[PDB]
């Protein structure tokens, strides 16, 4: 299917983005790759 994409002129007196709202989101922290941590090798003093 060949699709002709248009974007019709919005009513300037209506809100420009009908679906737009202030809403909070918790984003998932997904990650497939594990990152190594790469360190090397009198307690009364502290």
């Amino acid at each position: 299917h060949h699709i002709e994409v248009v974007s019709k002129q919005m009513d300037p007196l209506l809100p420009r983005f009908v679906g737009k709202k202030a809403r909070k989101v918790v984003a998932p922290t997904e990650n497939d790759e594990v990152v190594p941590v790469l360190h090397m090798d009198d307690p009364n003093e502290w």
Partner: protein, 97 residues
């Protein structure tokens, strides 16, 4: 003006209003940044890297030192490590200045 009002009516209010540093907030933000500065220095120099409870203990010593400075009472804690003592006195002198 009216645009922002009507935008609030339809879109709602922004979730993430960042308050600026006005003179009503000046002292509190100074305290927060000073506290974080002392904590960064002490957690970096401590050999054992133990954090969770130690931080809340150390900053109480900081605040007590500040009270002693304002009272002109000599701040001296027996058994305080000498380097951490120096760090606390350093930040107390900067706040004092």
């Amino acid at each position: 003006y009216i645009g922002n009002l009507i935008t609030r009516q339809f879109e709602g209010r922004s979730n993430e209003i960042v308050k600026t540093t006005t003179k009503q907030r000046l002292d509190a933000y100074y305290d927060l940044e000073l506290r974080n500065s002392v904590m960064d220095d002490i957690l970096e120099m401590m050999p054992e890297s133990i954090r969770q409870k130690k931080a809340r203990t150390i900053l109480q010593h900081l605040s007590e030192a500040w009270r002693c400075w304002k009272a002109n009472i000599p701040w001296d804690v027996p058994g305080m490590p000498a380097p951490i003592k120096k760090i606390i006195e350093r930040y107390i002198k900067s706040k004092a200045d």
